[PDB]
Design an enzyme around this catalytic site. Structure first.
Site, PDB file in Angstrom:
ATOM      1  N   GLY A  15       3.967  -5.523 -15.410  1.00  0.00           N
ATOM      2  CA  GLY A  15       4.437  -4.158 -15.430  1.00  0.00           C
ATOM      3  C   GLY A  15       5.788  -3.971 -14.812  1.00  0.00           C
ATOM      4  O   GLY A  15       6.342  -4.878 -14.172  1.00  0.00           O
ATOM      5  N   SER A  19      10.354  -5.507 -11.725  1.00  0.00           N
ATOM      6  CA  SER A  19       9.250  -5.876 -12.610  1.00  0.00           C
ATOM      7  C   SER A  19       8.425  -6.930 -11.951  1.00  0.00           C
ATOM      8  O   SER A  19       8.946  -7.726 -11.160  1.00  0.00           O
ATOM      9  CB  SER A  19       9.732  -6.367 -13.980  1.00  0.00           C
ATOM     10  N   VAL A  20       7.148  -6.915 -12.282  1.00  0.00           N
ATOM     11  CA  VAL A  20       6.121  -7.831 -11.791  1.00  0.00           C
ATOM     12  C   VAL A  20       5.620  -8.668 -12.961  1.00  0.00           C
ATOM     13  O   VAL A  20       5.271  -8.119 -14.006  1.00  0.00           O
ATOM     14  CB  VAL A  20       4.989  -7.109 -11.002  1.00  0.00           C
ATOM     15  N   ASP A 131       4.029   6.728  -2.312  1.00  0.00           N
ATOM     16  CA  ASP A 131       3.661   6.618  -3.762  1.00  0.00           C
ATOM     17  C   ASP A 131       2.195   6.237  -3.932  1.00  0.00           C
ATOM     18  O   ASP A 131       1.830   5.393  -4.783  1.00  0.00           O
ATOM     19  CB  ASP A 131       4.633   5.617  -4.450  1.00  0.00           C
TER      20      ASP A 131
HETATM   21  C1  4HZ Z   1       4.829  -3.122 -11.463  1.00  0.00           C
HETATM   22  C2  4HZ Z   1       3.400  -3.646 -11.329  1.00  0.00           C
HETATM   23  N1  4HZ Z   1       2.607  -3.163 -12.462  1.00  0.00           N
HETATM   24  C3  4HZ Z   1       1.386  -3.669 -12.814  1.00  0.00           C
HETATM   25  N2  4HZ Z   1       0.807  -4.710 -12.061  1.00  0.00           N
HETATM   26  C4  4HZ Z   1      -0.424  -5.155 -12.490  1.00  0.00           C
HETATM   27  C5  4HZ Z   1      -1.078  -6.208 -11.728  1.00  0.00           C
HETATM   28  C6  4HZ Z   1      -2.292  -6.788 -12.054  1.00  0.00           C
HETATM   29  N3  4HZ Z   1      -2.684  -7.702 -11.086  1.00  0.00           N
HETATM   30  C7  4HZ Z   1      -1.737  -7.721 -10.115  1.00  0.00           C
HETATM   31  N4  4HZ Z   1      -1.801  -8.480  -8.968  1.00  0.00           N
HETATM   32  C8  4HZ Z   1      -0.722  -8.338  -8.115  1.00  0.00           C
HETATM   33  C9  4HZ Z   1       0.382  -7.446  -8.428  1.00  0.00           C
HETATM   34 CL1  4HZ Z   1       1.632  -7.332  -7.262  1.00  0.00          CL
HETATM   35  C10 4HZ Z   1       0.447  -6.661  -9.601  1.00  0.00           C
HETATM   36  C11 4HZ Z   1      -0.667  -6.785 -10.499  1.00  0.00           C
HETATM   37  N5  4HZ Z   1      -1.095  -4.666 -13.600  1.00  0.00           N
HETATM   38  C12 4HZ Z   1      -0.524  -3.665 -14.326  1.00  0.00           C
HETATM   39  C13 4HZ Z   1       0.713  -3.125 -13.971  1.00  0.00           C
HETATM   40  F1  4HZ Z   1       1.232  -2.167 -14.675  1.00  0.00           F
HETATM   41  C14 4HZ Z   1       2.842  -3.157  -9.980  1.00  0.00           C
HETATM   42  O1  4HZ Z   1       3.182  -3.729  -8.915  1.00  0.00           O
HETATM   43  N6  4HZ Z   1       1.909  -2.103  -9.985  1.00  0.00           N
HETATM   44  C15 4HZ Z   1       1.390  -1.580  -8.727  1.00  0.00           C
HETATM   45  C16 4HZ Z   1       0.142  -2.257  -8.247  1.00  0.00           C
HETATM   46  F2  4HZ Z   1       0.322  -3.562  -8.020  1.00  0.00           F
HETATM   47  F3  4HZ Z   1      -0.304  -1.742  -7.104  1.00  0.00           F
HETATM   48  F4  4HZ Z   1      -0.852  -2.137  -9.110  1.00  0.00           F
END
Ligand code: 4HZ
Length: 285
Positions: A15, A19-20, A131
């Site tokens: 996501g 970006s992650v 947030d």
């Molecule tokens: C931008 C990132 N978006 C997303 N991340 C993940 C994810 C799955 N499993 C994960 N395990 C560790 C991390 Cl750091 C992310 C994910 N899944 C869907 C997303 F859209 C994000 O940090 N979102 C905030 C939060 F982590 F709290 F959910």
């Protein structure tokens, strides 16, 4: 221990917030490496890099069962990557939108208690999340959730109980306390207001037509646009306009939401008391 960039194998995009990505850290190059979550910057400006370095320091300083685990940093200085554990059940928002009412109230209150615990621990370090939303909560397994995305987190000044944001960026206004909307003031109390919105998200099972943006837009009128939304939302909250009781929400849970949504900052409950209250509800159930 250090992570070498060359050994980070891209697997899937997770996501965008930065970006992650889901990566395999595979230094043995035989695909037996650990699967990790990797945060990187899209627009690595000197401002965004300074802010990302602060998020890294914040996450590294937190060790709690209900806070996503920091693993390391990959430097391979101006293009940092934050390495974190990968939580396989996704965001709580995605998890609940998928399973809906199959996740019962006892299960929702277990997650609620865990979110309160992670938040109470964060408050002990004088950190303001800014947030808190189901999109920023991750599901480790059916029995454990963890708070994620410390990207907007601020550290309270030594002599104040609030952090004032001078030039706000993109803001989740539909989760904001009135004083955050009017004066850009963030505190433990404004994270408690956001927590009540998270409780609402949970008990609506992420139903799109019932989302905090959909409901507040209906109350202010769908004709409102841009900065007029903020103007009308402020007047609505001032006049006790609030999100409704979700369908089938237990009265005691709705009471908690309404108390978090108090215009008077000092009357909002503490995360210590919210964890005690939720655990008592769970015990009674
Ligand atoms: C931008 C990132 N978006 C997303 N991340 C993940 C994810 C799955 N499993 C994960 N395990 C560790 C991390 Cl750091 C992310 C994910 N899944 C869907 C997303 F859209 C994000 O940090 N979102 C905030 C939060 F982590 F709290 F959910």
């Amino acid at each position: 221990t250090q992570f070498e960039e060359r050994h980070l194998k891209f697997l899937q995009q997770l996501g965008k917030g930065g970006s992650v990505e889901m990566c395999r850290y595979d230094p043995l190059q035989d695909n037996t490496g650990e699967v990790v979550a990797v945060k990187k910057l899209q627009h690595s400006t000197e401002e965004h890099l300074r802010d990302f370095e602060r998020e890294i320091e914040i996450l590294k300083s937190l060790q709690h069962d209900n806070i996503v685990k920091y693993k390391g940093v990959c430097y391979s200085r101006r293009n940092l990557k934050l390495i974190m554990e990968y939580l396989p059940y996704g965001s709580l928002r995605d998890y609940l939108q998928k399973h809906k009412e199959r996740i019962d109230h006892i299960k929702l209150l277990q997650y609620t208690s865990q979110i309160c615990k992670g938040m109470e621990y964060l408050g002990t370090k004088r950190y303001i999340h800014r947030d808190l939303a189901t999109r920023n909560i991750l599901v480790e397994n059916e029995n454990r959730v963890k708070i994620g995305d410390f990207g907007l987190t601020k550290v309270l000044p030594q002599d104040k109980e609030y952090y004032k944001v001078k030039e706000p960026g993109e803001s989740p206004i539909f989760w904001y306390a009135p004083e955050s909307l009017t004066e850009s003031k963030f505190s433990v109390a404004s994270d408690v207001w956001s927590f009540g919105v998270v409780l609402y998200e949970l008990f609506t099972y992420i139903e799109k037509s019932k989302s905090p943006p959909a409901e507040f837009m209906r109350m202010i009128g769908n004709d409102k646009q841009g900065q007029m939304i903020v103007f009308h939302l402020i007047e609505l909250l001032k006049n006790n306009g609030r999100l409704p009781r979700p369908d089938g929400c237990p009265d005691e849970i709705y009471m908690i939401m309404t108390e978090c949504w108090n215009n008077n900052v000092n009357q909002r409950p503490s995360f210590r008391d919210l964890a005690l209250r939720v655990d008592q509800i769970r015990d009674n159930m």
